[PDB]
Amino acid sequence: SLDQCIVNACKNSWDKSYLAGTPNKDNCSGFVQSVAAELGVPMPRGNANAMVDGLEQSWTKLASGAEAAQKAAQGFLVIAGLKGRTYGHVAVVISGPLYRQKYPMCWCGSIAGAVGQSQGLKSVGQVWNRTDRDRLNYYVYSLASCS
C-alpha cells in the first residue's frame, strides 16, 4: 500500500493552522488545505460546503468507500465530503480495512472536538453518524501524490 505520504501529510497538517489562530485539528476544511498543500495538490478553497461544491464540479467521483480505500492505497489523495444545511464536513480517506465492511479509515479535523476528529484510526462511518455515513461522496485527485 502506497498511502504513506498522504498519512504523513495528514500527521504533519494536524498541528498546523491554515487559519491564523486555529489549529487544523479543529478546522475540518483547513485541515485538508494543508494536507493538499504538502502534496502539491490543488484543492478548491472555502468552508466545507464550498469545498464540496468544487470537488463535485471538478474532481473524479468514486462509487463506494471501498473504491475510495483502493485509490488511497494506490497513492491518490481522496476526499470524503458531505454538505450540510448549514455546515458541511470533509476528511482525507486512507487505505486499510473498511469498518463494518463498508466505511474506510480517515483523518479529519473538527470544530466539534474529539468526536468529530480522527487521526487515522476512526473510519468515516465513525466520524459521520448513522444517517450521514451512507450519504458520503468520495473524490479522488487525477494524479497520484505518492511514489
Length of the chain in terms of residues written: 147
Experimental method: X-ray
Decide: helix, strand or coil at residue 47.
coil
Residue 91: which of 57, 126, 66 has the closest Cα? 126
CATH topology of domain 1-147: endopeptidase fold (from Nostoc punctiforme) (3.90.1720)
Residue 117: all three cell numbers together:
476528529
For residues 61 and 102, give the distance between their C-alpha atoms in angstroms, rounded to a whole number.
17
Resolution (Å) of this entry: 2.6
Q: Three-state SS string across 66-124, please?
A: HHHHHHHHCCCCEEEEECCCCCCEEEEECCCCCECCCECEEEECCCCCHHHCEEEEEEH
- The structural domains of the chain, with segments of one domain joined by +, span 1-147
Active site positions, annotated = 28, 89
